[PDB]
A paper describes a structure:
[name] is a transmembrane MHC class I-like glycoprotein primarily abundant in the vasculature of large vessels, but present in numerous cell types. Since its identification, [name] has been mainly known for its role in accelerating the generation of the anticoagulant activated protein C (APC) and favoring its cytoprotective properties. The presence of a lipid bound to [name] is key for its biological functions.
For this, we performed a wide crystallization screen and obtained [name] crystals in varied conditions, which ultimately led to solution of the structure in three different space groups. Structural alignment against [name] in space group P3121 yielded root mean square deviations of 0.459 and 0.400 for [name] molecules in space groups [name] and P212121. We observed, however, non-homogeneous signals inside the lipid cavities. Despite the high resolution, we observed a less accurate electron density map in one of the two [name] molecules in space group [name], where the signal appears disconnected and fitting of a diacyl phospholipid results less satisfactory.
Author numbering: 9 to 105, 109 to 139, 141 to 177
Write the structure that this text describes.
């Protein structure tokens, strides 16, 4: 009983990103993400959700991506980022027979930061940089990247597993 979500973001520069990703419910592929930031495709492969719910979910994913891209631009604006770069986000929730939730971020294929939900705080996952410290400062500064995210993992994700498995 798990929802896993995987997003790879290909940045050619701060202002143009290509997304590719998918989600799996149980061990079954259920969603696909693809395309540039200015017109991203998001598909449920199986008709799991009704339109009013899918629209809210689709809108919610699109809103996340805007925040995600906005944060990458801010980090570039404030520290110098080396392009091209790829970012991988791996996240989701698992229901035991209380849910366990996670969100792990990698840059160019190496561990970068992850979310610790008991305090809704992000931590470094590498032992090596000004980029890492500024990103964590930004992620830990705003309600949207701590408490709203924790709720998405602990409430929205968990209700999706209960309703659709
Ligand atoms: C359903 C699946 C369909 C799509 C399948 C493909 C995978 C998509 C993965 C993304 C998951 C969606 C996240 C989401 O919707 O979160 C909202 C809130 O997020 C937030 O508020 C999070 C804000 C952004 C967090 C960014 C973390 C990235 C850190 C990396 C920084 C890199 C810096 C440069 C090196 C929900 O909100 P709700 O209201 O629906 O509940
Ligand atoms: C999901 O995307 C990853 C990353 O590109 C890919 O390696 C994997 O084969 C995809 N899996 C599914 C089930 O779509
Ligand atoms: C990521 O890898 C590309 C490919 O070599 C490189 O040009 C770029 O500088 C790297 N960026 C980071 C942030 O490691």
């Amino acid at each position: 009983q798990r929802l896993h979500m995987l997003q790879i973001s290909y940045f050619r520069d701060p202002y143009h990103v290509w997304y590719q990703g998918n989600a799996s419910l149980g061990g079954h592929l259920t969603h696909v993400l693809e395309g540039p930031d200015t017109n991203t495709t998001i598909i449920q492969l199986q008709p799991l959700q009704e339109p009013e719910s899918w629209a809210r979910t689709q809108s919610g994913l699109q809103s996340y991506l805007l925040q995600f891209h906005g944060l990458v631009r801010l980090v570039h604006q404030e520290r110098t980022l080396a392009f091209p770069l790829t970012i991988r986000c791996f996240l989701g929730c698992e229901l035991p027979p209380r849910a366990h939730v996670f969100f792990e971020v990698a840059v160019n294929g190496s561990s970068f930061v992850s979310f610790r939900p008991e305090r809704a705080l992000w931590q470094a996952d590498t032992q090596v940089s000004g980029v890492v410290t500024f990103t964590l400062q930004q992620l830990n500064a705003y309600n949207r990247t701590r408490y709203e995210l924790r709720e998405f993992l602990e409430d929205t994700c968990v209700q999706y597993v209960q309703k659709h498995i």
